[PDB]
Amino acid sequence: LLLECTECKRRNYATEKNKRNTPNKLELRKYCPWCRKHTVHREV
Amino acid sequence: TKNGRDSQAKRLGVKRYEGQVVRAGNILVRQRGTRFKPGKNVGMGRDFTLFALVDGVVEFQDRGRLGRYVHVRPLA
Amino acid sequence: PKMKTHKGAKKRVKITASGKVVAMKTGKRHLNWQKSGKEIRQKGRKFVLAKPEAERIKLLLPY
Amino acid sequence: GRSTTLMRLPKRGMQGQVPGEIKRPRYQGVNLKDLARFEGEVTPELLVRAGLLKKGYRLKILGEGEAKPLKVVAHAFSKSALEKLKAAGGEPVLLEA
RNA sequence: AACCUGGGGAACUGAAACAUCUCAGUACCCAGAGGAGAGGAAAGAGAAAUCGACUCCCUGAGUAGCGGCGAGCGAAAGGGGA
RNA sequence: AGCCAUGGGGGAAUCUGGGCGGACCACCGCCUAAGGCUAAGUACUCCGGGUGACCGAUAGCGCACCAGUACCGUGAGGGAAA
RNA sequence: GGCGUGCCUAUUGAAGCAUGAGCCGGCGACUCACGGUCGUGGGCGAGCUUAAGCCGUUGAGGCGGAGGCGUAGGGAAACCGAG
RNA sequence: GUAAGAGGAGGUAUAGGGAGCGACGCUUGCCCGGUGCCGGAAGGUCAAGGGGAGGGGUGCAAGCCCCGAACCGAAGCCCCGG
RNA sequence: CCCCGUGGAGCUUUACUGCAGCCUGGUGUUGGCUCUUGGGGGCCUAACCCUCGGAUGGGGGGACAGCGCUUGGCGGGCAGUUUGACUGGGGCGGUCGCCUCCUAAAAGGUAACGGAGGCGCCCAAAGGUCCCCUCAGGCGGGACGGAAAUCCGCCGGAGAGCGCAAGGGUAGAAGGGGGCCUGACUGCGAGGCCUGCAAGCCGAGCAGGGGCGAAAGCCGGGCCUAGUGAACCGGUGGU
Ligand SMILES: [Mg+2]
Ligand SMILES: [Mg+2]
Ligand SMILES: [Mg+2]
Ligand SMILES: [Mg+2]
Ligand SMILES: [Mg+2]
Ligand SMILES: [Mg+2]
Ligand SMILES: [Mg+2]
Ligand SMILES: [Mg+2]
Ligand SMILES: [Mg+2]
Ligand SMILES: [Mg+2]
Ligand SMILES: [Mg+2]
Ligand SMILES: [Mg+2]
Ligand SMILES: [Mg+2]
Ligand SMILES: [Mg+2]
Ligand SMILES: [Mg+2]
Ligand SMILES: [Mg+2]
Ligand SMILES: [Mg+2]
Ligand SMILES: [Mg+2]
Ligand SMILES: [Mg+2]
Ligand SMILES: [Mg+2]
Ligand SMILES: [Mg+2]
Ligand SMILES: [Mg+2]
Ligand SMILES: [Mg+2]
Ligand SMILES: [Mg+2]
Ligand SMILES: [Mg+2]
Ligand SMILES: [Mg+2]
Ligand SMILES: [Mg+2]
Ligand SMILES: [Mg+2]
Ligand SMILES: [Mg+2]
Ligand SMILES: [Mg+2]
Ligand SMILES: [Mg+2]
Ligand SMILES: [Mg+2]
Ligand SMILES: [Mg+2]
Ligand SMILES: [Mg+2]
Ligand SMILES: [Mg+2]
Ligand SMILES: [Mg+2]
Ligand SMILES: [Mg+2]
Ligand SMILES: [Mg+2]
Ligand SMILES: [Mg+2]
Ligand SMILES: [Mg+2]
Ligand SMILES: [Mg+2]
Ligand SMILES: [Mg+2]
Ligand SMILES: [Mg+2]
Ligand SMILES: [Mg+2]
Ligand SMILES: [Mg+2]
Ligand SMILES: [Mg+2]
Ligand SMILES: [Mg+2]
Ligand SMILES: [Mg+2]
Ligand SMILES: [Mg+2]
Ligand SMILES: [Mg+2]
Ligand SMILES: [Mg+2]
Ligand SMILES: [Mg+2]
Ligand SMILES: [Mg+2]
Ligand SMILES: [Mg+2]
Ligand SMILES: [Mg+2]
Ligand SMILES: [Mg+2]
Ligand SMILES: [Mg+2]
Ligand SMILES: [Mg+2]
Ligand SMILES: [Mg+2]
Ligand SMILES: [Mg+2]
Ligand SMILES: [Mg+2]
Ligand SMILES: [Mg+2]
Ligand SMILES: [Mg+2]
Ligand SMILES: [Mg+2]
Ligand SMILES: [Mg+2]
Ligand SMILES: [Mg+2]
Ligand SMILES: [Mg+2]
Ligand SMILES: [Mg+2]
Ligand SMILES: [Mg+2]
Ligand SMILES: [Mg+2]
Ligand SMILES: [Mg+2]
Ligand SMILES: [Mg+2]
Ligand SMILES: [Mg+2]
Ligand SMILES: [Mg+2]
Ligand SMILES: [Mg+2]
Ligand SMILES: [Mg+2]
Ligand SMILES: [Mg+2]
Ligand SMILES: [Mg+2]
Ligand SMILES: [Mg+2]
Ligand SMILES: [Mg+2]
Ligand SMILES: [Mg+2]
Ligand SMILES: [Mg+2]
Ligand SMILES: [Mg+2]
Ligand SMILES: [Mg+2]
Ligand SMILES: [Mg+2]
Ligand SMILES: [Mg+2]
Ligand SMILES: [Mg+2]
Ligand SMILES: [Mg+2]
Ligand SMILES: [Mg+2]
Ligand SMILES: [Mg+2]
Ligand SMILES: [Mg+2]
Ligand SMILES: [Mg+2]
Ligand SMILES: [Mg+2]
Ligand SMILES: [Mg+2]
Ligand SMILES: [Mg+2]
Ligand SMILES: [Mg+2]
Ligand SMILES: [Mg+2]
Ligand SMILES: [Mg+2]
Ligand SMILES: [Mg+2]
Ligand SMILES: [Mg+2]
Ligand SMILES: [Mg+2]
Ligand SMILES: [Mg+2]
Ligand SMILES: [Mg+2]
Ligand SMILES: [Mg+2]
Ligand SMILES: [Mg+2]
Ligand SMILES: [Mg+2]
Ligand SMILES: [Mg+2]
Ligand SMILES: [Mg+2]
Ligand SMILES: [Mg+2]
Ligand SMILES: [Mg+2]
Ligand SMILES: [Mg+2]
Ligand SMILES: [Mg+2]
Ligand SMILES: [Mg+2]
Ligand SMILES: [Mg+2]
Ligand SMILES: [Mg+2]
Ligand SMILES: [Mg+2]
Ligand SMILES: [Mg+2]
Ligand SMILES: [Mg+2]
Ligand SMILES: [Mg+2]
Ligand SMILES: [Mg+2]
Ligand SMILES: [Mg+2]
Ligand SMILES: [Mg+2]
Ligand SMILES: [Mg+2]
Ligand SMILES: [Mg+2]
Ligand SMILES: [Mg+2]
Ligand SMILES: [Mg+2]
Ligand SMILES: [Mg+2]
Ligand SMILES: [Mg+2]
Ligand SMILES: [Mg+2]
Ligand SMILES: [Mg+2]
Ligand SMILES: [Mg+2]
Ligand SMILES: [Mg+2]
Ligand SMILES: [Mg+2]
Ligand SMILES: [Mg+2]
Ligand SMILES: [Mg+2]
Ligand SMILES: [Mg+2]
Ligand SMILES: [Mg+2]
Ligand SMILES: [Mg+2]
Ligand SMILES: [Mg+2]
Ligand SMILES: [Mg+2]
Ligand SMILES: [Mg+2]
Ligand SMILES: [Mg+2]
Ligand SMILES: [Mg+2]
Ligand SMILES: [Mg+2]
Ligand SMILES: [Mg+2]
Ligand SMILES: [Mg+2]
Ligand SMILES: [Mg+2]
Ligand SMILES: [Mg+2]
Ligand SMILES: [Mg+2]
Ligand SMILES: [Mg+2]
Ligand SMILES: [Mg+2]
Ligand SMILES: [Mg+2]
Ligand SMILES: [Mg+2]
Ligand SMILES: [Mg+2]
Ligand SMILES: [Mg+2]
Ligand SMILES: [Mg+2]
Ligand SMILES: [Mg+2]
Ligand SMILES: [Mg+2]
Ligand SMILES: [Mg+2]
Ligand SMILES: [Mg+2]
Ligand SMILES: [Mg+2]
Ligand SMILES: [Mg+2]
Ligand SMILES: [Mg+2]
Ligand SMILES: [Mg+2]
Ligand SMILES: [Mg+2]
Ligand SMILES: [Mg+2]
Ligand SMILES: [Mg+2]
Ligand SMILES: [Mg+2]
Ligand SMILES: [Mg+2]
């Protein structure tokens, strides 16, 4: 499944690739945004 | 007849022989695996590509059981 | 009579002051998915042509 | 009969709307190097009166050159060229529009 | 004879195929006008609190734009003139 | 996707009236639709004249000459030689 | 007596049993317009040049700067500027 | 035939149009699932339109302007049979 | 005859796209009375249509039909076109991009409808870092086991493993296990490889803010080489 991360308290995006059915229901790895610095990023 | 196939030629092998002057960052050798090990002043990339790390001269060293090496002896 | 500028070209290329010709890198609006972040950062910089720079220039001239 | 190179892509956004052109004041730049080509005083009128301006209307003095002390009118000045002329003389801004 | 206005109106061709598109409101058919015909005293232009009927030339300009944004098509305000 | 024109349906007002300035709204401005006429500058060349770094009888108009003829074709039409 | 496989065309290759031509005379095919891009001969030069038109003339030229190219680039642009 | 109109016919189902077989004799069997055609006041899908919960642009406001859900909407197709 | 040409034309259909025609809702032409829950049923006459020995009228149909504008549908009756290339002639068959190996003549490159095989994915652990461990196999001994499960001993340098074809590489790890972890980062990028173009590939280091480590350091995914698609047109988010 194709995917793109969204930044919290905001709406940044980034390149990504989930995997759906396989062990991966939730997803929120870290990633550095341009504005501010370092924050969690939801699946979406 | 199922057979008329093959894949692109990758033009690999040694890209800079011994004694040849080299600029920092330029490539020394492209290879399938580590047919050549890095060594002094020579880094290696994801594909096993060897690239000079500073202006200098290329020289090759064989070390038997430990394999062949590519070196850049600096000077400036 | 009177050559017409090629609008298709003008809409995607520029003549530099020295007579060079530049355009955005191709392949960055589709194939996208997670190609190394490095790639797309480098698909942003525009580049110069070579021989079609001359083919290209002819298509302008009033420009 | 394959692709030309029309494979390249348009970036030049806003290549046009229906009525198209929007009439906005055009500024022509003019270096004070060619400005020192004489003396007395300078205004838009005088500048077009020889080579430069060519009725591009809005004058904007700027750039490299050794500035003569003279007074000069313009619709705008270079942040840097302003200091050079201010540092040897004087000069007023635009009329208004 | 040609020039003009109005009512109708192609295709080969170009797009290196082809249907939008092009050729073109061209070729041609029809009605009418006259030494010309049309147009014509702003329910205009469009950015200047500016211009001042219409027609014609130069320019603006292969610009603004239009376009299977392909092939290609292509103005006006303004300025110089009759 | 305004503006101009209008085949179909609905359908006002007379200046506290209407149109427009590129969807729409407000503001600021422009202009007065639904009657008609108007010279000149413009186009053309059957006709007359003038002039050619235009032809000189296989050229130049198809025709320098008794040619739109002889001849050809049911016909539209084709069309010489000299 | 010695020597000697037409001409053109097309071809890897033609005297060719591949093409075209009975012979002679005459007609007969890389042009012009506008716009480009190089080169070249000159005029002028941070300038260069006029278009329609007007006034002359009747194979005489002048006037006409409206306009165009150049003197600044970079950016999609707002904008900034030797950056 | 755009139309007016005309043929059909100055005829009227013992008539006229289309189709296939092709004097005459003896005959012409089984399949209606697919295709066509015929029949089917149900249902399903279905356009313009009607409708107007809800939402947006703008104005100080009266307002002007746009978007839009449920629901009501024919033939056709689906469906049911011959 | 045959083949070629992104030639032509006649014909065909459940090729594409249209057109005529036919079907159809709304609406104009379009009216009155009544029952009924804007719709439905019934009646009326005067629009409209047909007809009657002239008719300003009579009879028949009747707000239907016809016609106008608009909606959707059926639609080779008709129209414009498309219907690929390679190919020991063409059709038929097969093939078309990407990776591995051989052909390839010890740099690179190298053709044939030459010989052989794979790709159109996969993984939040199968990734990062720190720490630890080392295979396959053979022989001997061991309750189930029975050639092979798990345990012990001796030999064993790699014949195992490295997700998947092959190749190269590899235990002085790229392989197995564990702790913390998300660098499957942003802004760039000296200098190169490869190359007709456009593409593809490698990359030190600088800045920001980070992860593991005591630290030297390592991290811009995966041992590597396939896992892919210019531009146009449009979608969603944001400045
Ligand atoms: Mg997938
Ligand atoms: Mg999948
Ligand atoms: Mg077999
Ligand atoms: Mg092969
Ligand atoms: Mg080795
Ligand atoms: Mg690295
Ligand atoms: Mg793009
Ligand atoms: Mg474009
Ligand atoms: Mg306009
Ligand atoms: Mg006609
Ligand atoms: Mg056509
Ligand atoms: Mg055609
Ligand atoms: Mg064509
Ligand atoms: Mg041509
Ligand atoms: Mg062609
Ligand atoms: Mg064709
Ligand atoms: Mg099209
Ligand atoms: Mg046209
Ligand atoms: Mg026109
Ligand atoms: Mg006409
Ligand atoms: Mg007239
Ligand atoms: Mg006159
Ligand atoms: Mg007149
Ligand atoms: Mg008139
Ligand atoms: Mg007036
Ligand atoms: Mg405007
Ligand atoms: Mg005034
Ligand atoms: Mg004006
Ligand atoms: Mg004026
Ligand atoms: Mg002109
Ligand atoms: Mg388009
Ligand atoms: Mg046109
Ligand atoms: Mg004007
Ligand atoms: Mg002026
Ligand atoms: Mg004027
Ligand atoms: Mg308008
Ligand atoms: Mg109307
Ligand atoms: Mg009144
Ligand atoms: Mg009152
Ligand atoms: Mg109006
Ligand atoms: Mg107006
Ligand atoms: Mg308006
Ligand atoms: Mg206006
Ligand atoms: Mg406006
Ligand atoms: Mg105004
Ligand atoms: Mg006005
Ligand atoms: Mg008036
Ligand atoms: Mg009147
Ligand atoms: Mg009037
Ligand atoms: Mg009237
Ligand atoms: Mg008149
Ligand atoms: Mg003429
Ligand atoms: Mg003539
Ligand atoms: Mg004459
Ligand atoms: Mg004459
Ligand atoms: Mg002569
Ligand atoms: Mg003669
Ligand atoms: Mg003679
Ligand atoms: Mg003759
Ligand atoms: Mg005669
Ligand atoms: Mg004859
Ligand atoms: Mg003749
Ligand atoms: Mg001999
Ligand atoms: Mg010989
Ligand atoms: Mg010859
Ligand atoms: Mg012979
Ligand atoms: Mg022969
Ligand atoms: Mg031949
Ligand atoms: Mg011969
Ligand atoms: Mg020949
Ligand atoms: Mg003969
Ligand atoms: Mg030539
Ligand atoms: Mg030239
Ligand atoms: Mg010169
Ligand atoms: Mg001049
Ligand atoms: Mg003057
Ligand atoms: Mg003047
Ligand atoms: Mg730019
Ligand atoms: Mg009909
Ligand atoms: Mg009709
Ligand atoms: Mg009849
Ligand atoms: Mg009849
Ligand atoms: Mg009859
Ligand atoms: Mg019968
Ligand atoms: Mg019958
Ligand atoms: Mg039977
Ligand atoms: Mg039976
Ligand atoms: Mg059946
Ligand atoms: Mg059956
Ligand atoms: Mg049945
Ligand atoms: Mg059936
Ligand atoms: Mg079947
Ligand atoms: Mg069916
Ligand atoms: Mg059917
Ligand atoms: Mg029935
Ligand atoms: Mg129903
Ligand atoms: Mg059902
Ligand atoms: Mg539904
Ligand atoms: Mg609706
Ligand atoms: Mg508000
Ligand atoms: Mg409000
Ligand atoms: Mg408010
Ligand atoms: Mg407000
Ligand atoms: Mg409101
Ligand atoms: Mg609606
Ligand atoms: Mg119902
Ligand atoms: Mg229905
Ligand atoms: Mg069916
Ligand atoms: Mg039934
Ligand atoms: Mg083809
Ligand atoms: Mg139809
Ligand atoms: Mg109806
Ligand atoms: Mg209807
Ligand atoms: Mg009706
Ligand atoms: Mg009605
Ligand atoms: Mg009710
Ligand atoms: Mg009611
Ligand atoms: Mg009655
Ligand atoms: Mg009655
Ligand atoms: Mg009557
Ligand atoms: Mg009665
Ligand atoms: Mg009646
Ligand atoms: Mg009706
Ligand atoms: Mg109708
Ligand atoms: Mg139909
Ligand atoms: Mg059907
Ligand atoms: Mg259909
Ligand atoms: Mg069809
Ligand atoms: Mg053979
Ligand atoms: Mg064959
Ligand atoms: Mg065959
Ligand atoms: Mg085949
Ligand atoms: Mg091959
Ligand atoms: Mg396979
Ligand atoms: Mg692994
Ligand atoms: Mg150990
Ligand atoms: Mg064994
Ligand atoms: Mg044993
Ligand atoms: Mg044992
Ligand atoms: Mg044992
Ligand atoms: Mg045992
Ligand atoms: Mg047991
Ligand atoms: Mg056993
Ligand atoms: Mg045992
Ligand atoms: Mg053991
Ligand atoms: Mg032992
Ligand atoms: Mg080993
Ligand atoms: Mg081995
Ligand atoms: Mg191995
Ligand atoms: Mg393995
Ligand atoms: Mg593996
Ligand atoms: Mg291997
Ligand atoms: Mg080692
Ligand atoms: Mg591991
Ligand atoms: Mg490990
Ligand atoms: Mg673990
Ligand atoms: Mg650098
Ligand atoms: Mg580079
Ligand atoms: Mg390249
Ligand atoms: Mg090229
Ligand atoms: Mg680095
Ligand atoms: Mg740092
Ligand atoms: Mg690194
Ligand atoms: Mg990846
Ligand atoms: Mg892996
Ligand atoms: Mg790694
Ligand atoms: Mg690993
Ligand atoms: Mg490799
Ligand atoms: Mg396209």
Side-chain angles (χ1 to χ4, degrees), chain C residues 1 11 13 15-16 18 29 33 36 45 48 55 57-58 60-61:
Chain C
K11 287 167 181 275
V13 168
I15 279 66
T16 75
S18 95
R29 256 314 147 108
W33 78 322
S36 84
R45 59 191 180 186
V48 308
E55 265 196 2
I57 286 183
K58 308 281 285 190
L60 306 181
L61 307 166

PDB file of all heavy atoms in Angstrom, chain C residues 1 11 13 15-16 18 29 33 36 45 48 55 57-58 60-61:
ATOM      1  N   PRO C   1       5.760  33.742 -44.386  1.00  0.00           N
ATOM      2  CA  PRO C   1       6.605  34.908 -44.111  1.00  0.00           C
ATOM      3  C   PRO C   1       6.471  35.360 -42.668  1.00  0.00           C
ATOM      4  O   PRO C   1       5.395  35.265 -42.084  1.00  0.00           O
ATOM      5  CB  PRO C   1       6.035  35.973 -45.044  1.00  0.00           C
ATOM      6  CG  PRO C   1       4.600  35.611 -45.166  1.00  0.00           C
ATOM      7  CD  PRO C   1       4.551  34.106 -45.145  1.00  0.00           C
ATOM      8  N   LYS C  11       7.084  27.872 -23.582  1.00  0.00           N
ATOM      9  CA  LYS C  11       6.355  27.494 -22.381  1.00  0.00           C
ATOM     10  C   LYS C  11       7.139  26.566 -21.456  1.00  0.00           C
ATOM     11  O   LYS C  11       6.608  26.129 -20.436  1.00  0.00           O
ATOM     12  CB  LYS C  11       5.016  26.849 -22.747  1.00  0.00           C
ATOM     13  CG  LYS C  11       3.959  27.811 -23.262  1.00  0.00           C
ATOM     14  CD  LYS C  11       2.808  27.041 -23.897  1.00  0.00           C
ATOM     15  CE  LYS C  11       1.739  27.972 -24.434  1.00  0.00           C
ATOM     16  NZ  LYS C  11       0.758  28.368 -23.384  1.00  0.00           N
ATOM     17  N   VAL C  13      11.164  26.423 -21.723  1.00  0.00           N
ATOM     18  CA  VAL C  13      12.601  26.592 -21.898  1.00  0.00           C
ATOM     19  C   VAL C  13      12.983  28.072 -21.832  1.00  0.00           C
ATOM     20  O   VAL C  13      12.157  28.944 -22.103  1.00  0.00           O
ATOM     21  CB  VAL C  13      13.050  26.004 -23.247  1.00  0.00           C
ATOM     22  CG1 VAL C  13      14.464  26.416 -23.565  1.00  0.00           C
ATOM     23  CG2 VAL C  13      12.917  24.491 -23.236  1.00  0.00           C
ATOM     24  N   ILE C  15      16.355  30.915 -22.786  1.00  0.00           N
ATOM     25  CA  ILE C  15      17.698  31.234 -23.239  1.00  0.00           C
ATOM     26  C   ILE C  15      18.420  32.016 -22.147  1.00  0.00           C
ATOM     27  O   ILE C  15      17.953  33.071 -21.710  1.00  0.00           O
ATOM     28  CB  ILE C  15      17.693  32.058 -24.542  1.00  0.00           C
ATOM     29  CG1 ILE C  15      17.508  31.148 -25.751  1.00  0.00           C
ATOM     30  CG2 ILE C  15      18.997  32.811 -24.701  1.00  0.00           C
ATOM     31  CD1 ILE C  15      16.174  30.480 -25.805  1.00  0.00           C
ATOM     32  N   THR C  16      19.554  31.490 -21.699  1.00  0.00           N
ATOM     33  CA  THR C  16      20.371  32.184 -20.715  1.00  0.00           C
ATOM     34  C   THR C  16      21.104  33.319 -21.404  1.00  0.00           C
ATOM     35  O   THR C  16      21.230  33.335 -22.628  1.00  0.00           O
ATOM     36  CB  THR C  16      21.408  31.253 -20.095  1.00  0.00           C
ATOM     37  OG1 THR C  16      22.465  31.035 -21.034  1.00  0.00           O
ATOM     38  CG2 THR C  16      20.775  29.922 -19.729  1.00  0.00           C
ATOM     39  N   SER C  18      24.116  33.999 -21.822  1.00  0.00           N
ATOM     40  CA  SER C  18      25.270  33.639 -22.633  1.00  0.00           C
ATOM     41  C   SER C  18      24.870  32.867 -23.888  1.00  0.00           C
ATOM     42  O   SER C  18      25.705  32.597 -24.751  1.00  0.00           O
ATOM     43  CB  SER C  18      26.309  32.863 -21.811  1.00  0.00           C
ATOM     44  OG  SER C  18      26.155  31.459 -21.940  1.00  0.00           O
ATOM     45  N   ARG C  29       6.799  13.789 -11.253  1.00  0.00           N
ATOM     46  CA  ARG C  29       5.386  14.138 -11.123  1.00  0.00           C
ATOM     47  C   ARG C  29       4.472  12.918 -11.159  1.00  0.00           C
ATOM     48  O   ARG C  29       3.262  13.043 -11.334  1.00  0.00           O
ATOM     49  CB  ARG C  29       4.983  15.129 -12.216  1.00  0.00           C
ATOM     50  CG  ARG C  29       4.851  16.541 -11.694  1.00  0.00           C
ATOM     51  CD  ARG C  29       4.060  16.536 -10.388  1.00  0.00           C
ATOM     52  NE  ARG C  29       4.497  17.582  -9.468  1.00  0.00           N
ATOM     53  CZ  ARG C  29       3.792  18.669  -9.185  1.00  0.00           C
ATOM     54  NH1 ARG C  29       2.602  18.852  -9.737  1.00  0.00           N
ATOM     55  NH2 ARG C  29       4.272  19.561  -8.334  1.00  0.00           N
ATOM     56  N   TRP C  33       6.901   8.265  -5.422  1.00  0.00           N
ATOM     57  CA  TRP C  33       6.252   7.297  -4.538  1.00  0.00           C
ATOM     58  C   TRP C  33       7.036   7.168  -3.248  1.00  0.00           C
ATOM     59  O   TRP C  33       6.467   6.978  -2.173  1.00  0.00           O
ATOM     60  CB  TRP C  33       6.172   5.920  -5.196  1.00  0.00           C
ATOM     61  CG  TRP C  33       7.468   5.150  -5.156  1.00  0.00           C
ATOM     62  CD1 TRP C  33       8.732   5.654  -5.298  1.00  0.00           C
ATOM     63  CD2 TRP C  33       7.622   3.741  -4.951  1.00  0.00           C
ATOM     64  NE1 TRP C  33       9.659   4.647  -5.194  1.00  0.00           N
ATOM     65  CE2 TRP C  33       9.004   3.462  -4.985  1.00  0.00           C
ATOM     66  CE3 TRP C  33       6.724   2.688  -4.745  1.00  0.00           C
ATOM     67  CZ2 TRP C  33       9.508   2.173  -4.823  1.00  0.00           C
ATOM     68  CZ3 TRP C  33       7.228   1.410  -4.585  1.00  0.00           C
ATOM     69  CH2 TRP C  33       8.607   1.163  -4.625  1.00  0.00           C
ATOM     70  N   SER C  36      14.265   7.799  -3.616  1.00  0.00           N
ATOM     71  CA  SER C  36      15.110   8.410  -2.599  1.00  0.00           C
ATOM     72  C   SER C  36      14.858   9.909  -2.556  1.00  0.00           C
ATOM     73  O   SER C  36      14.793  10.566  -3.595  1.00  0.00           O
ATOM     74  CB  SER C  36      16.587   8.134  -2.876  1.00  0.00           C
ATOM     75  OG  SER C  36      17.111   9.071  -3.799  1.00  0.00           O
ATOM     76  N   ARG C  45      16.360  20.915  -9.483  1.00  0.00           N
ATOM     77  CA  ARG C  45      17.294  21.759 -10.209  1.00  0.00           C
ATOM     78  C   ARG C  45      17.084  21.630 -11.716  1.00  0.00           C
ATOM     79  O   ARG C  45      16.942  20.525 -12.240  1.00  0.00           O
ATOM     80  CB  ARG C  45      18.731  21.391  -9.839  1.00  0.00           C
ATOM     81  CG  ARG C  45      19.098  19.946 -10.136  1.00  0.00           C
ATOM     82  CD  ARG C  45      20.434  19.582  -9.510  1.00  0.00           C
ATOM     83  NE  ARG C  45      20.816  18.195  -9.773  1.00  0.00           N
ATOM     84  CZ  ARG C  45      21.879  17.598  -9.239  1.00  0.00           C
ATOM     85  NH1 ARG C  45      22.671  18.264  -8.405  1.00  0.00           N
ATOM     86  NH2 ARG C  45      22.152  16.334  -9.535  1.00  0.00           N
ATOM     87  N   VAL C  48      20.939  22.409 -18.435  1.00  0.00           N
ATOM     88  CA  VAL C  48      21.160  22.879 -19.804  1.00  0.00           C
ATOM     89  C   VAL C  48      21.203  21.710 -20.797  1.00  0.00           C
ATOM     90  O   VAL C  48      21.580  20.596 -20.428  1.00  0.00           O
ATOM     91  CB  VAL C  48      22.474  23.654 -19.903  1.00  0.00           C
ATOM     92  CG1 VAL C  48      22.514  24.736 -18.849  1.00  0.00           C
ATOM     93  CG2 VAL C  48      23.657  22.712 -19.739  1.00  0.00           C
ATOM     94  N   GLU C  55      18.852  23.475 -31.964  1.00  0.00           N
ATOM     95  CA  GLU C  55      17.532  23.161 -32.504  1.00  0.00           C
ATOM     96  C   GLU C  55      16.501  24.051 -31.809  1.00  0.00           C
ATOM     97  O   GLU C  55      15.642  24.653 -32.452  1.00  0.00           O
ATOM     98  CB  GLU C  55      17.180  21.681 -32.284  1.00  0.00           C
ATOM     99  CG  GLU C  55      17.501  20.734 -33.453  1.00  0.00           C
ATOM    100  CD  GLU C  55      16.783  19.364 -33.357  1.00  0.00           C
ATOM    101  OE1 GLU C  55      15.994  19.147 -32.408  1.00  0.00           O
ATOM    102  OE2 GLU C  55      17.005  18.499 -34.240  1.00  0.00           O
ATOM    103  N   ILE C  57      16.831  26.962 -29.985  1.00  0.00           N
ATOM    104  CA  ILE C  57      16.958  28.406 -30.163  1.00  0.00           C
ATOM    105  C   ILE C  57      16.284  28.873 -31.454  1.00  0.00           C
ATOM    106  O   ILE C  57      15.600  29.899 -31.479  1.00  0.00           O
ATOM    107  CB  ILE C  57      18.437  28.864 -30.165  1.00  0.00           C
ATOM    108  CG1 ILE C  57      19.036  28.839 -28.753  1.00  0.00           C
ATOM    109  CG2 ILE C  57      18.554  30.268 -30.739  1.00  0.00           C
ATOM    110  CD1 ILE C  57      20.480  29.361 -28.676  1.00  0.00           C
ATOM    111  N   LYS C  58      16.471  28.108 -32.523  1.00  0.00           N
ATOM    112  CA  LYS C  58      15.904  28.464 -33.816  1.00  0.00           C
ATOM    113  C   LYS C  58      14.395  28.643 -33.713  1.00  0.00           C
ATOM    114  O   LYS C  58      13.814  29.482 -34.393  1.00  0.00           O
ATOM    115  CB  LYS C  58      16.227  27.384 -34.844  1.00  0.00           C
ATOM    116  CG  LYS C  58      17.700  27.038 -34.929  1.00  0.00           C
ATOM    117  CD  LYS C  58      18.483  28.065 -35.734  1.00  0.00           C
ATOM    118  CE  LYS C  58      18.230  27.903 -37.231  1.00  0.00           C
ATOM    119  NZ  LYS C  58      19.144  28.730 -38.079  1.00  0.00           N
ATOM    120  N   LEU C  60      12.771  30.056 -31.671  1.00  0.00           N
ATOM    121  CA  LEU C  60      12.426  31.327 -31.035  1.00  0.00           C
ATOM    122  C   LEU C  60      12.846  32.520 -31.887  1.00  0.00           C
ATOM    123  O   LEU C  60      12.236  32.803 -32.917  1.00  0.00           O
ATOM    124  CB  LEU C  60      13.054  31.405 -29.648  1.00  0.00           C
ATOM    125  CG  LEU C  60      12.682  30.196 -28.790  1.00  0.00           C
ATOM    126  CD1 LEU C  60      13.297  30.295 -27.418  1.00  0.00           C
ATOM    127  CD2 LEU C  60      11.172  30.070 -28.679  1.00  0.00           C
ATOM    128  N   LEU C  61      13.887  33.216 -31.445  1.00  0.00           N
ATOM    129  CA  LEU C  61      14.521  34.272 -32.232  1.00  0.00           C
ATOM    130  C   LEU C  61      13.890  35.662 -32.083  1.00  0.00           C
ATOM    131  O   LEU C  61      14.576  36.593 -31.664  1.00  0.00           O
ATOM    132  CB  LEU C  61      14.661  33.848 -33.697  1.00  0.00           C
ATOM    133  CG  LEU C  61      15.367  32.492 -33.814  1.00  0.00           C
ATOM    134  CD1 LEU C  61      15.213  31.915 -35.200  1.00  0.00           C
ATOM    135  CD2 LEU C  61      16.839  32.589 -33.422  1.00  0.00           C
TER     136      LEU C  61
END
